Every structure is written in C-alpha cells, then in structure tokens.
Amino acid sequence: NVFQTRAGCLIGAEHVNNSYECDIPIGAGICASYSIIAYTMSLGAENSVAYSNNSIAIPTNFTISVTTEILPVS
Amino acid sequence: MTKTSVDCTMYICGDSTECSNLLLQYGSFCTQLNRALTGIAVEQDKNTQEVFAQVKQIYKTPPIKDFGGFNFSQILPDPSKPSKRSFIEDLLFNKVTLFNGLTVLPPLLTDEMIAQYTSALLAGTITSGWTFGAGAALQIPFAMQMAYRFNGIGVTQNVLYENQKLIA
Amino acid sequence: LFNGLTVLPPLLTDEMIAQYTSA
Amino acid sequence: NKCVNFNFNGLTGTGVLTESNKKFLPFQQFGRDIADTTDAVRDPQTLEILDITPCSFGGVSVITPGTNTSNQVAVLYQDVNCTEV
Amino acid sequence: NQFNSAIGKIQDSLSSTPSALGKLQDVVNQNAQALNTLVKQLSSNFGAISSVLNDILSRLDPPEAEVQIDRLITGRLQSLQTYVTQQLIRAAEIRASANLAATKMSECVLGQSKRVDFCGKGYHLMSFPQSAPHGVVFLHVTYVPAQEKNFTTAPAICHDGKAHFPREGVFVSNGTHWFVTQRNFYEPQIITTDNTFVSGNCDVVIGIVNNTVYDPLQPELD
Amino acid sequence: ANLAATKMSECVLGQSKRVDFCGKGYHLMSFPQSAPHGVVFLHVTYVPA
Ligand SMILES: *[C@@H]1O[C@H](CO)[C@@H](O)[C@H](O)[C@H]1NC(C)=O
Ligand SMILES: *[C@@H]1O[C@H](CO)[C@@H](O)[C@H](O)[C@H]1NC(C)=O
Ligand SMILES: *[C@@H]1O[C@H](CO)[C@@H](O)[C@H](O)[C@H]1NC(C)=O
Ligand SMILES: *[C@@H]1O[C@H](CO)[C@@H](O)[C@H](O)[C@H]1NC(C)=O
Ligand SMILES: *[C@@H]1O[C@H](CO)[C@@H](O)[C@H](O)[C@H]1NC(C)=O
Ligand SMILES: *[C@@H]1O[C@H](CO)[C@@H](O)[C@H](O)[C@H]1NC(C)=O
Ligand SMILES: *[C@@H]1O[C@H](CO)[C@@H](O)[C@H](O)[C@H]1NC(C)=O
Ligand SMILES: *[C@@H]1O[C@H](CO)[C@@H](O)[C@H](O)[C@H]1NC(C)=O
Numbered sequence: 222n223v224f225q226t227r228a229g230c231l232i233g234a235e236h237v238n239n240s241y242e243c244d245i246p247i248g249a250g251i252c253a254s255y256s257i258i259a260y261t262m263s264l265g266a267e268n269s270v271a272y273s274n275n276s277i278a279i280p281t282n283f284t285i286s287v288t289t290e291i292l293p294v295s
Numbered sequence: 296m297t298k299t300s301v302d303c304t305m306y307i308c309g310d311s312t313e314c315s316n317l318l319l320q321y322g323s324f325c326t327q328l329n330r331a332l333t334g335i336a337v338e339q340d341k342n343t344q345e346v347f348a349q350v351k352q353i354y355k356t357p358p359i360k361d362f363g364g365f366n367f368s369q370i371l372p373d374p375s376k377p378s379k380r381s382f383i384e385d386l387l388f389n390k391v392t393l394f395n396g397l398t399v400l401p402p403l404l405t406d407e408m409i410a411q412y413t414s415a416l417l418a419g420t421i422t423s424g425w426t427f428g429a430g431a432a433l434q435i436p437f438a439m440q441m442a443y444r445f446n447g448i449g450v451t452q453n454v455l456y457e458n459q460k461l462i463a
Numbered sequence: 464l465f466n467g468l469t470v471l472p473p474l475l476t477d478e479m480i481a482q483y484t485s486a
Numbered sequence: 487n488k489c490v491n492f493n494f495n496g497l498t499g500t501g502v503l504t505e506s507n508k509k510f511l512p513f514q515q516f517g518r519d520i521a522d523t524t525d526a527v528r529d530p531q532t533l534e535i536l537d538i539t540p541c542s543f544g545g546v547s548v549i550t551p552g553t554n555t556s557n558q559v560a561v562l563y564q565d566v567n568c569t570e571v
Numbered sequence: 572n573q574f575n576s577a578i579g580k581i582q583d584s585l586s587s588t589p590s591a592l593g594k595l596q597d598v599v600n601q602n603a604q605a606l607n608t609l610v611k612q613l614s615s616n617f618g619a620i621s622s623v624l625n626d627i628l629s630r631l632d633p634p635e636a637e638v639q640i641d642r643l644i645t646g647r648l649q650s651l652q653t654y655v656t657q658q659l660i661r662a663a664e665i666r667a668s669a670n671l672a673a674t675k676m677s678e679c680v681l682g683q684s685k686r687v688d689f690c691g692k693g694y695h696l697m698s699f700p701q702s703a704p705h706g707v708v709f710l711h712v713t714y715v716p717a718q719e720k721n722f723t724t725a726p727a728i729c730h731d732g733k734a735h736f737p738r739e740g741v742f743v744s745n746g747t748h749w750f751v752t753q754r755n756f757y758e759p760q761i762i763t764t765d766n767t768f769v770s771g772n773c774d775v776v777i778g779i780v781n782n783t784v785y786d787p788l789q790p791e792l793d
Numbered sequence: 794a795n796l797a798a799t800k801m802s803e804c805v806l807g808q809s810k811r812v813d814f815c816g817k818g819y820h821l822m823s824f825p826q827s828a829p830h831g832v833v834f835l836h837v838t839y840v841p842a
Contacts, residue, residue, distance in 0.1 A: 321618040326608075430693055452726055453726070
C-alpha cells in the first residue's frame with residue numbers, strides 16, 4: 222500500500238514484483254496501471270538468438286506493411 | 296540534459312504571503328516559466344525514449360559466447376552484476392565527477408535500463424547487423440553477415456574468410 | 464478549433480496543398 | 487455601427503457596440519467572452535441585450551514593385567471593409 | 572491483396588484511432604495557451620495598481636498616472652518580447668522538423684531509401700504523402716518477411732580441390748543437399764557452376780564441406 | 794538527439810554508405826555504449842593498406 226521511492230513517497234498503490242509495459246510514467250523506470258497500482262516499466266520481451274556458427278534461417282513469406290510517419294510542417 | 300524541478304515562488308521571494316500578493320498582482324510569469332520547464336522535461340523524456348526505445352523486443356544473448364573466438368570481457372555486460380555494465384561503461388561512469396528548495400529530479404531511465412536497452416540493442420546487432428532495424432533479429436554466424444556487408448560494398452566473403460582469423 | 468489581435472489565414476489553402484499532393 | 491466611448495448606467499467602456507440576440511439572466515448585466523473581452527450588455531434604460539463589438543481596426547501594408555520599375559503602388563485595407571475609408 | 576487490406580486497415584484504425592495525431596493538436600493547444608496567457612497578461616497589473624489605465628486617466632493626474640503607466644508598459648514590453656521569444660523557439664523547432672520532413676519526402680516519396688527506419692521501420696518499399704490542415708503525413712509502405720525456417724549454410728564447397736564461392740547467393744541444405752537461394756527470402760535454385768564462382772582452393776577456409784557443383788557442359792556432347 | 798538517433802539508425806541498425814556519418818573510413822560497424830547522461834557509438838571502419 223504505502224511506499225517511499227526515489228521520486229518521493231507513494232501511498233495506496235502497490236509496489237509490485239512484476240514489470241509490464243509503461244502506462245503511467247512515474248520516474249526511474251517506474252510506471253503504474255491496474256485498483257491502479259505502481260510498478261516497474263517492462264523493457265519489452267526477452268528473446269534468445271538461435272546462435273549457430275553453421276546455421277541460418279530465412280523467411281518464406283512476407284507482408285506488405287504500411288505505416289504513417291507523422292511530421293510537423295507549419 | 297538534467298530535468299529540473301523548480302519551487303519558483305519561494306525562490307522568487309521565500310515565505311512571504313505579502314510577496315504572493317505582489318506577484319499575483321504582477322501576473323503569472325513564473326507560471327509561463329514552469330510550463331517552459333515542463334516542456335523541456337517532456338522533450339527529453341521523449342528524446343531519451345526515441346534514443347533507446349527503438350526496439351519493442353528484449354533480446355538476450357545465449358550463455359554461449361561463440362562469435363568467432365573473440366574475447367569481450369571488458370565491453371559486454373559483466374555476469375558478476377556490477378550493474379551489468381562493461382568495464383568501459385564502468386570508466387564512462389567513473390569519468391563523470393559531480394539544495395535550497397531548488398532540486399533536480401533523478402533521470403527517468405536509470406543506468407540499469409539504459410544498460411539492458413543497450414544489451415538488447417547489441418545482441419540484435421551482432422546476430423542481425425541490419426535486419427532487426429528492418430524487423431526481427433535473425434540468426435547469423437556473423438561471418439556471413441560481414442559477407443553480406445562486403446556484398447553491400449561489392450566485395451566477396453572469401454576475403455574475410457581468407458584472413459578472418461587475422462581480422463578477428 | 465479577436466481583440467485587435469488577429470491571425471492571418473494560411474497562405475496555401477488546403478485546395479493547393481491537395482493538388483500539390485495529387486501531382 | 488460606430489466605435490464609441492460608452493458609459494451605461496455608470497458602466498463605461500469604449501468600442502463599437504451593436505445589438506445582440508443573447509438573453510442574460512434577469513440579474514445578469516454584461517458579458518465577456520473568454521479572454522475577459524466584453525461581448526454584450528443589458529441595456530441601462532431598457533435592460534435589453536446589446537452586442538459589444540471590437541473597435542474596428544486593421545493592418546497597414548504597402549505594396550510595391552520597387553522604385554526603379556515605377557513610382558506606382560497598390561494599397562491594402564487589411565481584413566477590413568473598404569467601405570470604411 | 573495485402574496492399575489494399577493494409578490500406579483498409581489504416582482506414583479503420585484512423586477512423587477509430589485516438590492519440591495518433593495528438594501532436595499537431597498539442598501544437599494548436601500550445602500556441603493557444605501562448606496567446607491566452609498574453610491576453611490574461613494585458614488584463615494584468617505587472618506590479619501596477621490596476622490592470623486598466625483608462626480608470627487612471629479618468630481619475631488621476633499626469634505625473635502619477637504616467638509613472639504607473641511606465642511600470643504598466645514595461646510589464647507589457649516583456650510580455651510581448653517574451654511571447655516573441657516563445658514563438659521563435661517554436662519556429663526553430665518547426666524549421667528543424669520541416670527540413671527533416673522535406674528530406675523524408677525526398678528520400679521516401681521521391682526515391683527509394685536504404686536508410687534504416689528513416690522511412691518507417693521495416694524493409695523499405697514506399698511512402699504516400701497525405702496533407703493535413705497544418706501538416707502533411709506520409710503513409711509509409713514497408714516490407715516484412717515472414718516464415719523464417721532454419722537450415723545450415725556453407726560459405727563454399729570443396730570440389731575439384733577448389734572452393735567455389737557464391738557469385739551472388741548462398742548455399743543451404745535442407746537435410747541432405749544443397750540449394751542456392753538468396754539471402755533474405757527462401758528463393759531456391761539448384762547449386763550449379765553457372766551461379767557460383769571459384770577463387771582458389773579449399774585448404775584454408777573454416778566451414779567448407781566436400782560436395783559437387785553441377786555443370787551443364789557435358790550434355791553439350793550429346 | 795535527432796542526429797544521434799539517425800546515427801544509430803544508420804550505423805548500428807544498418808550499414809550506411811554515408812561518408813564520415815559513421816566515423817571516417819570505409820564503413821564496417823558501430824557499437825553503442827551508454828553514458829550517465831549520454832551514449833557513445835564505438836564505430837568500426839575499414840582502412841585499406
Ligand atoms: C528449427 O526449426 C523448427 C521449425 O518450427 C523450430 O521449431 C526450431 O525452433 C528451430 N530451431 C531453433 C533453434 O529454434
Ligand atoms: C561450429 O559449431 C560446431 C558445433 O555447433 C563446433 O563443434 C565447431 O567447433 C564450430 N566451428 C568452429 C570453427 O569452432
Ligand atoms: C503467406 O501467407 C499467406 C497468408 O494466408 C498464405 O496465403 C501464403 O500461402 C503464405 N505463403 C506465401 C509464400 O505467401
Ligand atoms: C424610462 O422612463 C420613461 C418615463 O415614463 C418611460 O416612458 C420609459 O418606458 C422608460 N424606459 C423603458 C426602457 O421602459
Ligand atoms: C533600373 O535598373 C536598370 C537595370 O536593370 C537600369 O538600367 C535603370 O537605370 C534603373 N532605373 C533607374 C531609374 O535607376
Ligand atoms: C464587411 O465585410 C464582410 C466580409 O465578407 C461582409 O460579410 C460584410 O457584409 C461587410 N459589411 C459591410 C457593411 O460592408
Ligand atoms: C530435401 O531432400 C530431399 C531428399 O531427402 C529432396 O528430394 C527434396 O527435394 C528436399 N526437400 C524436401 C522437402 O525433402
Ligand atoms: C574432402 O576430400 C578430401 C580428399 O578426398 C579429404 O581429404 C577430405 O577429408 C574431404 N573432406 C570432407 C569434409 O569430406
């Protein structure tokens with residue numbers, strides 16, 4: 222419930238063990254979300270390379286991805 | 296840049312309600328200044344965020360360090376956990392030598408973050424080189440990725456494979 | 464989306480930017 | 487349709503005032519839009535609603551091809567009706 | 572099919588999507604705060620007795636009224652040149668972003684760029700500009716490969732006492748034999764003498780293997 | 794910061810032909826390496842001889 226942190230002392234929101242993607246940025250990497258509780262920004266998802274000196278994988282398909290890159294002009 | 300926090304008024308005079316009359320009776324310039332310094336603060340949260348939130352995927356390297364017999368003890372995250380920073384980043388941290396109602400906020404992304412953002416980045420590089428910037432990190436021995444690199448310049452793989460032991 | 468202060472209208476009206484974009 | 491200095495039942499201001507269709511609360515006298523700029527008032531004699539409007543104005547820009555082409559010049563009344571000349 | 576499904580998908584998101592543009596809305600909110608503060612200054616004392624000089628004039632004398640106006644006018648002369656400073660640091664950020672957008676269109680719309688993530692993230696295809704009331708947006712089209720699938724490689728192969736190296740290609744084996752596909756798709760053909768080049772023997776390489784390279788040159792005989 | 798983001802996009806996340814945009818010499822490669830308030834790229838580049 223109550224916690225004292227770097228950014229000060231936060232109360233009523235549980236400092237947790239977990240870490241998910243940031244929703245409510247607090248500071249020092251520390252964010253909050255769902256009732257709504259304080260937790261640590263999750264950096265992303267942890268994946269290991271199938272490192273072989275003697276192997277490769279190449280894709281047999283693709284998509285046509287379209288994206289919008291938004292810029293200020295005036 | 297350092298993200299500040301400012302207790303403007305109390306600097307502006309420091310614990311005089313009489314003042315606060317004189318200031319609200321002067322306007323809200325300190326208010327415009329606070330908006331300016333919040334805009335700074337968000338701008339460089341955003342700056343750091345585009346600087347390092349460039350991948351949506353935390354890569355880990357294997358327990359197997361086999362990049363061609365190379366030795367990497369001083370530049371990679373140290374398994375002893377001295378903040379999992381390289382000994383080079385240990386120097387870069389050593390190499391920086393550092394109140395009144397005015398304070399400075401602590402950096403949003405603590406070196407531990409920037410460290411394993413960089414670690415995920417560097418795994419993605421060594422396994423992919425350029426593909427993870429175009430998508431996912433895709434396995435490669437790193438001999439054939441410099442092969443593709445020399446192809447980008449228009450040169451063979453065999454030149455690296457001819458001396459790749461030298462070249463390492 | 465006054466007082467003797469006004470704002471000029473954009474030099475290139477959306478019709479321009481539209482057929483510049485079309486070309 | 488005249489920018490004029492007005493003092494209505496002790497309420498004084500300057501500008502061009504016209505009629506407004508707005509309805510003030512029976513106790514409510516005079517109105518300012520956001521920015522605290524008066525827009526309409528309830529008549530002192532009749533307590534009817536009359537629009538407060540900005541003292542007309544405009545920019546003054548002078549348009550040239552340069553001297554040495556000519557001493558000729560075009561002139562612009564600026565976001566302004568040229569009825570007001 | 573996927574090109575126009577993706578266009579429909581941007582369709583449906585953008586009709587539904589919030590917080591996508593939020594940035595040009597911020598910039599208008601942001602100029603708007605600027606001038607609203609400027610107004611709420613002009614109705615502000617700046618350390619003066621009143622915010623209105625007219626009441627002064629109608630009740631006070633030239634000297635005191637004019638000193639009060641001196642302090643009033645000093646306050647507004649900051650508030651203006653402060654506003655101007657505000658605006659031309661906005662305009663500097665705009666001018667930077669505008670050079671960046673002009674370069675963006677030059678490289679993504681008017682050409683094909685190898686720059687990574689300079690035309691959006693993924694393998695570059697294409698970008699469609701699309702204007703805004705006070706802006707323009709590029710609809711960036713980019714390629715994502717899919718169905719990776721793991722095989723083993725070999726830089727060359729020991730044959731005729733030679734390491735025959737790919738002229739432009741790679742050699743993979745499915746489990747037992749040895750096809751030439753390209754680097755970033757599975758586009759196979761068969762490993763042959765006419766699609767790989769020799770430079771030297773095979774007595775130095777690490778990772779070479781023994782196997783044959785087909786050569787369509789005896790069947791000319793019959 | 795825009796310049797550094799572009800630097801990593803082109804040198805770390807890709808192979809760039811830009812001259813001296815990833816350090817001087819024939820481009821190979823660049824390893825980013827963070828700082829207390831910054832990050833540095835360890836640029837790897839080829840010199841013929
Ligand atoms: C090799 O191929 C199969 C294809 O589904 C995959 O499941 C397996 O994970 C691949 N190898 C590695 C190391 O992932
Ligand atoms: C290649 O990998 C195999 C097993 O993955 C290993 O035994 C071999 O030593 C490696 N090649 C070299 C040159 O180390
Ligand atoms: C790729 O994915 C689509 C999705 O349905 C599928 O139809 C197609 O067979 C897959 N393979 C290739 C080579 O496109
Ligand atoms: C003001 O007083 C006169 C005098 O009787 C009256 O006729 C007039 O109606 C009054 N004004 C209004 C708006 O009623
Ligand atoms: C205007 O410029 C021309 C040269 O372009 C020059 O010959 C001429 O004298 C100029 N007119 C006057 C009035 O100076
Ligand atoms: C003044 O100009 C505006 C601009 O369109 C017009 O709508 C209005 O009718 C004009 N009024 C007069 C009196 O000229
Ligand atoms: C892999 O090798 C087989 C024989 O083992 C060969 O005939 C075939 O063309 C290749 N592809 C598959 C799917 O087996
Ligand atoms: C290739 O052939 C030579 C001679 O036949 C032999 O010495 C060598 O061991 C062979 N290597 C492989 C990988 O089969």
